[PDB]
């Protein structure tokens, strides 16, 4: 079995997974709409009661299973719980990253595509007034995606967008086909420093922005000025808990797959706590200093509410390009911005397609070459539903990431800490650890964390409870689960023979 080469590489690869576009775009928006700086109170709390406990568990399960040649949840859940339902629930943690890859890599191609368009200068050049600056970029993005102009729910992506998507896929394969150490780790050692420099360079440049409508100080001011009256809202505490899940990448079965390449007695407690910290630092320091400020610096603090309500997607794909087109040398600023985003996602995409690669290698005994190409083949095919069927993306994202990861997360708790036994589990987390987990976390992991998850579930289960074309997507994603259930079946039939 393959292994991480260096402790640093492990943490960077982990951190490379956790730091995606969400750090720079989703996190700033959520904070501004939920009390600004006061949002740090439920966020930090959820980071201690939910994020940190759940991270150590997936790290534990991964390493536990990885010692026995199994990096995937179908196998691992059968080890923690010798049962048929365990292998079935384990399917989800092979299903979720595979559904996300069906659109994530695609969105990742956009950044690459835009970064190419920005570098060569193939960007709109307005013209005055905000709608007169945004619209040329609104139409610029829609032509790329192929956003439906008619009543038909049909996308028509440009030939360029598609070609970049092929390239993007090819880029992902190029890294993944070299393995864990010489591929993901070696790239994590390059991308993460590259990421940091690009972030810092923008943070510096954003702070130097000065328009008649305001400055970057006004942006950091609005974003961080605490509104404690919103802490009364349970929805904020739900958005916080949901965000920690989103930003740490919990419940995707990717931490489990990745930790399974950590050696049996190697530390997971401290190494994990570091990778988790790297992610959070990236968000609060770099992420909330680039997007929101530059948007407020240009449109004024008056539109700071309207900008935050415009969504995290408009901010990164319509707003921020529109602003760079108005700044000195901003064509290159656009290029850096998107080239920052590309690697942020490229370090995440490679990480989650490993789950399917690890499955074919461990359970179906495929070589690394085949396991990669067939995983690429699957992703590439399924992505066509996202590329062409309008709102297919959103539907996939709603199930896989909305409840898929939250449900599978709470499943991970009960299986490892309640079914497998808490004592046996606690030793599995702390074993080989440079530092030991605080004795108080035993109660957090056993009661507080599942309580938070179960009462995030109920809050999700009710209010979060569309055109007929969503069924096409439902049809497909259900079909995937059945397909994976079948491979698990074939996986256990191949083992009884040998």
Ligand X SMILES: CNCC[C@@H](Oc1ccc(C(F)(F)F)cc1)c1ccccc1
Q: Contact positions toward ligand X, by CB under 6 A?
A: 17-18, 20, 22, 97, 100-101, 104, 246-247, 249, 252, 254, 348-349, 352-353, 397, 401
Please report whether residue 18 would count as binding Na ion according to CB under 5 A: yes
Q: How many residues bind Na ion (CB under 5 A)?
A: 10
From Na ion, ligand X, none, which one binds at residue 412 (CB under 5 to 8 Å depending on kind)? Answer: none
Least distance from Na ion to the Cβ atom of residue 399, Å: 21
Instruction: Find the part of the chain contacting Na ion (CB under 5 A) among 49-57, 162-170, 278-286, 304-312.
Output: 278-286
Least distance from ligand X to the Cβ atom of residue 246, Å: 6
Helix 84-119, helix 368-388: angle, nearest 10: 70
What residues between 329 and 348 interact with Na ion by CB under 5 A?
Answer: 344, 347-348
Q: Which is nearer to Na ion, 9 or 74 (CB)?
A: 9
Write the burial class of residue 460 (CB in 10 Å: 0-12 exposed, 13-18 middle, 19+ buried).
middle
For 3, 212, 254, 256, 381, the CA distances from 354, given in Å and listed in that order, are 13, 48, 8, 11, 17
Least distance from ligand X to the Cβ atom of residue 331, Å: 28
d(CA 247, CA 244): 5
Please provide the size of the chain in residues: 498
From ligand X, Na ion, none, which one binds at residue 97 (CB under 5 to 8 Å depending on kind)? Answer: ligand X
Residues ending a continuous segment of the chain before a break (C–N > 2.5 Å): 127, 465
* Other Cβ atoms within 10 Å of 208 Cβ, number: 12
Least distance from Na ion to the Cβ atom of residue 243, Å: 9
Write the burial class of residue 1 (CB in 10 Å: 0-12 exposed, 13-18 middle, 19+ buried).
middle
From Na ion, ligand X, none, which one binds at residue 23 (CB under 5 to 8 Å depending on kind)? Answer: Na ion
d(CA 188, CA 12): 5
Please report whether residue 23 would count as binding Na ion according to CB under 5 A: yes
User: Does 462 belong to an annotated binding site?
Assistant: no
What is the phi-psi region of residue 211: left when phi exceeds 0, alpha when psi lies from -120 to 50, beta otherwise? beta
Binding track, positions 247-276, relative to Na ion; x by CB under 5 A: x-----------------------------
Q: Which is nearer to ligand X, 104 or 261 (CB)?
A: 104
Selection from 476, 105, 11, 29 nearest residue 296 by Cα: 29
Least distance from ligand X to the Cβ atom of residue 186, Å: 19
Least distance from ligand X to the Cβ atom of residue 104, Å: 4
Q: Which is nearer to ligand X, 26 or 117 (CB)?
A: 26
From ligand X, Na ion, none, which one binds at residue 347 (CB under 5 to 8 Å depending on kind)? Answer: Na ion
354 within 8 A of 179, measured Cβ to Cβ: no
d(CA 423, CA 430): 11
Residues at the contact surface with Na ion, assessed by CB under 5 A:
18-20, 22-23, 247, 279, 344, 347-348
Please give the annotated binding residues for phosphocholine, written as ranges. Answer: 84
């Amino acid at each position: 079995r393959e292994h991480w080469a260096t402790r640093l590489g492990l943490i960077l690869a982990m951190a490379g997974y956790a730091v995606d576009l969400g750090n720079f775009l989703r996190f700033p928006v959520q904070a501004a709409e939920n009390g600004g700086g006061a949002f740090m109170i439920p966020y930090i709390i959820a980071f201690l009661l939910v994020g940190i406990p759940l991270m150590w568990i997936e790290w534990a399960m991964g390493r536990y299973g990885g010692a026995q040649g199994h990096g995937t949840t179908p196998a691992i859940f059968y080890l923690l719980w010798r049962n048929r339902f365990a292998k079935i629930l384990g399917v989800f943690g092979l299903w979720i990253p595979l559904v996300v890859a069906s659109y994530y890599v695609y969105i990742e191609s956009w950044t690459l595509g835009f970064a190419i368009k920005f570098l060569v200068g193939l960007v709109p050049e307005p013209p005055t007034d905000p709608d007169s600056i945004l619209r040329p970029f609104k139409e610029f993005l829609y032509s790329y995606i192929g956003v439906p102009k008619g009543d038909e729910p049909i996308l028509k992506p440009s030939l360029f967008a598609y070609i970049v998507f092929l390239i993007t896929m090819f880029i992902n394969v190029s890294i993944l086909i070299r393995g864990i150490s010489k591929g993901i780790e070696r790239f994590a050692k390059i991308a993460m420093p590259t990421l940091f420099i690009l972030a810092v360079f923008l943070v510096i440049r954003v702070f130097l922005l000065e328009t008649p409508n305001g400055t970057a100080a006004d942006g950091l001011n609005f974003l961080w000025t605490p509104d404690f009256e919103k802490l009364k809202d349970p929805g904020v505490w739900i958005a916080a808990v949901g965000q920690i899940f989103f930003s740490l990448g919990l419940g995707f079965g990717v931490l489990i797959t990745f930790a399974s390449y950590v050696r049996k007695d190697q530390d997971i407690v401290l190494s994990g706590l570091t990778a988790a910290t790297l992610n959070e630092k990236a968000s609060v320091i770099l992420g909330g200093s680039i997007s929101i400020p530059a948007a407020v610096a240009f449109f004024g603090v008056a539109n700071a509410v309207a900008i935050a309500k415009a969504g995290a997607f408009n901010l990164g794909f319509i707003t921020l390009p529109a602003i760079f087109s108005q700044t000195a040398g901003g064509t290159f600023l656009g290029f850096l911005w998107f080239f920052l985003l590309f690697f942020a996602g490229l370090t995440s995409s490679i990480a989650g397609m490993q789950g399917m690669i690890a499955f074919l290698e461990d359970e179906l005994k495929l070589s690394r070459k085949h396991a990669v190409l067939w995983t690429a083949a699957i992703v590439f095919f399924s992505a066509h539903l996202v590329m062409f069927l309008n709102k297919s993306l959103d539907e996939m994202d709603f199930w896989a990431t909305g409840i898929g990861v939250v449900f599978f997360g709470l499943t991970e708790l009960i299986i490892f800490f309640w079914i497998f036994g808490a004592d046996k589990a606690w030793e599995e987390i702390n074993r080989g650890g440079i530092i030991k987990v605080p004795r108080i976390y035993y109660y957090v992991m056993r009661y507080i964390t599942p309580a938070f998850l179960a009462v995030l579930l109920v809050v999700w289960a009710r209010e979060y409870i569309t055109h007929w074309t969503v069924w096409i997507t439902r049809f497909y994603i259900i079909g995937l689960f059945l397909f994976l259930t079948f491979l698990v079946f074939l996986a256990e039939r191949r083992r009884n023979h040998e």
